[PDB]
């Protein structure tokens, strides 16, 4: 990124080092990129990338027989550099992903197969997800939205560094209704104590998904406050994570929530599907059910939707009838100031202070007129 | 075992083979024993045998410091053939087995440590056992003896080849009170179906202790009927296992039941200890609580104790007052015949038909007199 084309004569790069790390710095300047691996490499005859690859072609209906499988193996990048394929096919058979009809040896997708493909889910993750859902449908808590959120809470990657001492403090202060959900999932208070007392991550044993469970329940709490319209600064102080890690999490959970919804629909689990089908939109914007209609407008996010709701505008229909200058004023009240704000400067009438995507700078007035204009266009398309 | 010392001139050994397996047979005749491994060998820096070895010397109080540890490492068979030790010490620290007091670096046993040593349990198994007990004390079924038996049901080795189709048939016919115990443990009906329908053992994943759970619950059912004085032939037909596999199981479970009882006592878990402390004796002989007093006599097993109980002799005290020839007759009624038995042969008055340990052949009369004689000696020692 050193050197602007058409602007600079040269691009300069400086790597600051010490005498001790002097040799490692030179290694980088002379270093070159490593050769590209296939990521489908084989004491592991089976592998995730291959299992998914084989599942996609069989369920999709472009690979039926055993001859089609090895023909596919020829097209891979792994074979370009110049058994394992057969192992993945059996794996799909053992775990009810694929069917075999002896037309000798022809493979067809199951309901679980077609569901996994439509859900864009990884076959390795689908097994635990399928069990987790069946476990939840045997005993489910409906008095709050926490248990539902847990099912759509992603835990395939760490989104933040969790302070366990902070976690235990929230555990005790946690209401009884949410402790019931914790117990029902696997959250044991004993494991939480062995985390604060001693910084033993363990996780060496495969059976230590016990760690992931507590990380997942911690995350669901964050997502619970998030769709409860709890301020980002409160969530930051309460949990110990920045706004960057949160936004990356909600956009991840919004997508994941859609996956579990599709997965539940293709298996015929209507009751479970019915509950989940409202959280994709709520996780995206971080809102409650009431603001779901307002946030259809492009410029209206969580903060702008709430202040317009609390001012009499509950729906797009109510927002189309709106007086523009009234919308503008309500927007002006949602701004965050360090001092308890909420002189006359008439030189700020042209200040473009509202950002969009692929944006021209919008004034607070122009944005308001756009919100009312868009609301009317949507109101007509609703008929 | 070919050649009797002082009897035979030679010992002959014949290995019958085919032309195809001819070469493998010669390999055995010329073959010799492999060198003895240390079984404490090290991508495994930690190992079970070492962890147990280190735990025993610290808890026992013969190894306190870090110098004592490597001094011990010198005495091992592994070092005789001529790092890992330090890894095991940390493991004992991470899992609350051992304490460290910075007298720089001195290691002491915890309550969990001293309990494991007194229980003769393996440190690797103790972790899951400790969790299983804590899980059981949160929700425990007392209406039957099944849930208690599960806690003392050993599953570290396979004692028989379980027919899963047979298992599912017993599952449906299983009463509601015992289905509640199954659910409470982990027995899912879905996994039972995927065993009968398809012979997929899986168990490749470490998290597949789900297999062990169903094997363990199957075993507890056998142990339940066993202490319910259900005939060995019925248990054989019902489950599909021989009397040899059963006897090896009960003597294994009798010992294991004693271990869990001691383990519970050293942790202060009195309520749990109280329930378990009656099953070591019942698992040994395969009896109900009523026969616990009778089986104190050496010659009285499960079968002989029951027929004497059903005939008026409930205790050793009642058995000391007994008329010998009456005891003899009751014993004669407990014999199993193929025909519906239960001529006059007075030539069988000297037939030694009762076996003992380190035995002279006992007549049904001599045995009866021994039972009454022993009962009197015990009755006096009871005072
Ligand atoms: K929007
Ligand atoms: K006895």
Swiss-Prot record, chains A, B:
Annotated tissue distribution: Highly expressed in testis.
Modification after translation (UniProt): Phosphorylated by PLK1; promoting interaction with TOPBP1 and recruitment to DNA damage sites.
Compartment(s): Nucleus; Chromosome
Positions of region (Interaction with RAD51): 343-383
Record function comment: Low-fidelity DNA polymerase with a helicase activity that promotes microhomology-mediated end-joining (MMEJ), an alternative non-homologous end-joining (NHEJ) machinery required to repair double-strand breaks in DNA during mitosis. MMEJ is an error-prone repair pathway that produces deletions of sequences from the strand being repaired and promotes genomic rearrangements, such as telomere fusions, some of them leading to cellular transformation. MMEJ is required during mitosis to repair persistent double-strand breaks that originate in S-phase.
Disease affiliated with this protein: Breast cancer: A common malignancy originating from breast epithelial tissue. Breast neoplasms can be distinguished by their histologic pattern. Invasive ductal carcinoma is by far the most common type. Breast cancer is etiologically and genetically heterogeneous. Important genetic factors have been indicated by familial occurrence and bilateral involvement. Mutations at more than one locus can be involved in different families or even in the same case.
Free-text domain note: The loop 2 region is involved in the binding of the 2 ends of resected double-strand breaks and homomultimerization.
Subunit structure: Homomultimer; forms homodimers and homotetramers. Interacts with RAD51. Interacts with ORC2 and ORC4. Interacts with RHNO1; interaction takes place during mitosis and promotes POLQ recruitment to DNA damage sites. Interacts (when phosphorylated) with TOPBP1 (via BRCT domains 7 and 8); promoting POLQ recruitment to DNA damage sites.
Listed name of the protein: DNA polymerase theta
Provenance organism: Homo sapiens (Human)
Range within the parent protein: 480 to 891 of 2590
């Amino acid at each position: 990124r050193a050197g602007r084309k058409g602007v600079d004569t040269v691009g300069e790069s400086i790597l600051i080092c010490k005498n001790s790390e002097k040799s490692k710095g030179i290694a980088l300047l002379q270093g070159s990129l490593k050769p590209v691996r296939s990521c489908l490499q084989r004491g592991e005859e089976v592998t995730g990338s291959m299992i998914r690859a084989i599942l996609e072609i069989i369920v999709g209906g472009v690979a039926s027989t055993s001859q089609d499988m090895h023909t596919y193996a020829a097209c891979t990048f792994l074979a370009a550099s110049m058994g394992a394929i057969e192992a993945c096919v059996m794996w799909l058979l053992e775990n009810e992903f694929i069917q075999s009809t002896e037309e000798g040896k022809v493979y067809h997708p199951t309901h679980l197969g077609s569901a996994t493909l439509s859900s864009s889910l990884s076959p390795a993750d689908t097994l635990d997800i399928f069990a987790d859902l069946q476990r939840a449908m045997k005993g489910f808590v409906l008095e709050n939205d926490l248990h539902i959120l847990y099912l759509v809470t992603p835990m395939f990657e760490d989104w933040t560094t969790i302070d366990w001492y902070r976690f235990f403090c929230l555990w005790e202060k946690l209401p009884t209704s949410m402790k019931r959900v914790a117990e029902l999932v696997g959250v044991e208070e004993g494991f939480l104590a062995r985390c604060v007392k001693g910084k033993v991550v363990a996780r060496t044993e495969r059976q230590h998904r016990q760690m992931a469970i507590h990380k997942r329940f911690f995350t669901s709490l964050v997502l619970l406050d998030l769709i409860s319209e709890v301020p980002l600064r409160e969530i930051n102080q309460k949990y110990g994570c920045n706004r960057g890690q949160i936004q990356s999490l909600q956009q991840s959970a919004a997508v994941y929530a859609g996956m579990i919804t599709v997965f539940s629909n293709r298996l015929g689990w209507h009751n479970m599907e019915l509950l989940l089908s409202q959280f994709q939109k709520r996780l995206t914007f971080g809102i409650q059910r009431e603001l779901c209609d307002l946030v259809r407008v492009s410029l209206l996010n969580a903060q702008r939707a709430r202040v317009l709701y609390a001012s009499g505008f509950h729906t797009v229909a109510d927002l189309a009838r709106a007086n523009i200058v009234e919308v503008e004023v309500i927007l002006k009240n949602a701004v965050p100031f360090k001092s308890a704000r909420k002189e006359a400067v008439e030189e700020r009438r042209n200040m473009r202070t509202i950002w969009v995507t692929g944006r021209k700078g919008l004034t607070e007035r122009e944005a308001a007129a756009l919100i009312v204009e868009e609301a009317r266009m949507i109101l007509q398309q609703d008929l």
